[PDB]
Design a protein around this ligand. Structure first.
Ligand SMILES: [Ag+]
Ligand SMILES: [Ag+]
Lengths: 296, 297
C-alpha cells in the first residue's frame, strides 16, 4: 500500500512502424532548359565551357552565322530604295521571322541598316551545363539541339517502396529525409509523388520526391536516407513499462478509482516503439500503472 | 466502329492483394514433447532395442522395473481377503497405493491372479520420437526423477520472419499459403497460427508461429519452407488490367454507357497487382468497361 507511483491510462489508437530506406538523388527533367536553332546555319566562337559548368543566367554560349537568311534580308534591303510599297517589304519580314529570325535583330537591321551579320545566343536560365562541348565550326540543321542546362532549385530523391506498404502513405510528414554527406540544418521536402510503376524485381514502386535545394548543398547520385513512418489499424494501447510477464502468463494492473488494484488478463497483439497494443484483455478507458512499485 | 465479338467488364470498389513469399524454418513444438518420470524410488529390468532417437508408435514399452516397499503393503492387504477384514478396510489401502502410484491395470491383476505383484513395465505416453534415454540394465533411481523424453511430430512448427509494418494486415489463416521444395506432394494444411510479439531488432521483424498438420509425417525440421503470403489494401475502384491501355503519358480506357456506344475516358492508375489495377481517380463505381475486346479505328 505505497503511493510513490505514476499513473497511466489505456487508450485506443494505432502504432507507428519505423523504416529507413535507400535513396539516390536526381535531377528533375523538368527544371531544365534547352536552346535550339531557329533554322540551319554555321558557327563561330564558343566560350571556355565544358559539359558542366556554372552559368550565372543569361550569358553567351556561342556566336553563329547563317547564309541563305541573308539572301532576302538584302533583297528586302533594296526595297527601301526602289520604292516598293510598304506592304511589300513587310510581307517579306514576316516571311523571315517565319523561317525564324529573332525579333530584336530585325529592328536592328531596319535601324542600323547594315545587313545582319552573325548573332550570338545566350543561355536562358541560371543552372548547370549538361551536354555541349561541340565547338568551332559546324554545320547544323533547323530546330536541332545545341545544348542543355540543369536547374537546381528543386531536386529529386527516389526511394524504392514495397507495394505491400505503399497505400499506407498519404502525407508528407511520414517522411523524414537525412543525408550522410550533409547533416546540417534541415532537409525540407517540397512535394511527394509515387510512380505506380512496379519494379518487377522486388514489388517496388519508385517514390519520387522534390526536395528544396536552395543553399545548393547537394549534387546528384549521392547517398540519401529516408525515415518513413507507417501506421496500423487502431488497437487498445498501453505504455510498455506498465506491462509484465515472463512465461505463459501475460497481463497487468487494473486500477479502479477506489485506489484498489487487481490482476486483469491481456494478450499482447504486438509491440513497437516502447509501447504495446493488446489484441484483447482490457477496456478502452481503463487505468494502469507504469513506473510503479509495491509489495506482496 | 461496330464489332461485338467481345467480353464485358464492370468497374467495382475494393482492395488489391499483395503477394509475398517468405523464408521459413521448420521446428518442433516445445509443447508436443513428453517426459516419463518415476513415481518413487525403484530398480530396473529389461530396456528394449531403443536408441536416443527412434520411432515409438504410441503407448509402447520402454522398460520394466522392480520395486520393494510397494510389496510391503500389497501383501498386508492380501491377508485381509483371508483374515476377514471388512471390505472397507482393504479398499482403504488400495487407494493408499494408487496414491503412492500403482497402475490401475495392475491392481486388477493383484486382485484377480492373486499372486502378489512382481514387477511392472512402463509404456510411452505419446506417439513420437525418443530424445534422451539410452540408460539401461540395472540401475538405482530416486522418486520423480526423469528417465526419458519424447518429441511429438503430429503438429509441427514453422516460423516466418515477418515485418511489423505489414504485421497487423494479417488476420486469417487463408492468406497463408505454405509450400515446401522437399515435398511438393498434396496439401500443406495449417492448424492454427500466431505471432510472438518479440520484434527481432535486426530488421523490424516478428516471428510467425504456424502449427502445420504433419500426419503422413513427411517433414523433419531444419528443412526449407516457403510462405506465400497475401496482404490487402484500403478499398479503391478496380478494373481488369487487360481492359486498360497506355504506353506513354496517356492513360485511360473504355467507357461503355449502355447504349452500346463507347468513349475515351481518362483515368489515373494508383498501382497494379495480381493482374488487375486500381485507379486513384478516373472512372465511376459501377461504370462499364471492356476486357478481351478488339476492334478498329
Ligand atoms: Ag490490429
Ligand atoms: Ag488507390
Amino acid at each position: 500500500q505505497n503511493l510513490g507511483v505514476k499513473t497511466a491510462t489505456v487508450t485506443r489508437g494505432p502504432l507507428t512502424f519505423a523504416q529507413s530506406f535507400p535513396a539516390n538523388v536526381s535531377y528533375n527533367e523538368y527544371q531544365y532548359a534547352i536552346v535550339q536553332a531557329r533554322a540551319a546555319g554555321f558557327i563561330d566562337k564558343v566560350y571556355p565551357l565544358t559539359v558542366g559548368d556554372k552559368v550565372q543566367k543569361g550569358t553567351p554560349l556561342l556566336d553563329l552565322t547563317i547564309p541563305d537568311w541573308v539572301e532576302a534580308q538584302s533583297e528586302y534591303l533594296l526595297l527601301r530604295e526602289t520604292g516598293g510599297t510598304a506592304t511589300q517589304t513587310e510581307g517579306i519580314l514576316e516571311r523571315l521571322r517565319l523561317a525564324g529570325m529573332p525579333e530584336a535583330d530585325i529592328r536592328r537591321l531596319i535601324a542600323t541598316q547594315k545587313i545582319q551579320t552573325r548573332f550570338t545566343l545566350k543561355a536562358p536560365i541560371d543552372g548547370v551545363i549538361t551536354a555541349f562541348d561541340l565547338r568551332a565550326g559546324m554545320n547544323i540543321a533547323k530546330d536541332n539541339v545545341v545544348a542543355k542546362i540543369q536547374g537546381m532549385d528543386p531536386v529529386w530523391v527516389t526511394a524504392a517502396i514495397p507495394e505491400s506498404i505503399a497505400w499506407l502513405v498519404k502525407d508528407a510528414s511520414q517522411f523524414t529525409l537525412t543525408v550522410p554527406a550533409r547533416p546540417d540544418k534541415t532537409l525540407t521536402i517540397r512535394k511527394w509523388t509515387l510512380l505506380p510503376g512496379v519494379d518487377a524485381a522486388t514489388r517496388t514502386l519508385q517514390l519520387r520526391l522534390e526536395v528544396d535545394n536552395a543553399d545548393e548543398a547537394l549534387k546528384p547520385g549521392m547517398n540519401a536516407w529516408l525515415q518513413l513512418n507507417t501506421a496500423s489499424e487502431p488497437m487498445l494501447l498501453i505504455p510498455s513499462q506498465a506491462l509484465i510477464d515472463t512465461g505463459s502468463e501475460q497481463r497487468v494492473i487494473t486500477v479502479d478509482a477506489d485506489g484498489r488494484f487487481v490482476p486483469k488478463r491481456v494478450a499482447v497483439f504486438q509491440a513497437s516503439q516502447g509501447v504495446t497494443a493488446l489484441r484483447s484483455g482490457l477496456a478502452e478507458g481503463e487505468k494502469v500503472v507504469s513506473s510503479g512499485l509495491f509489495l506482496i
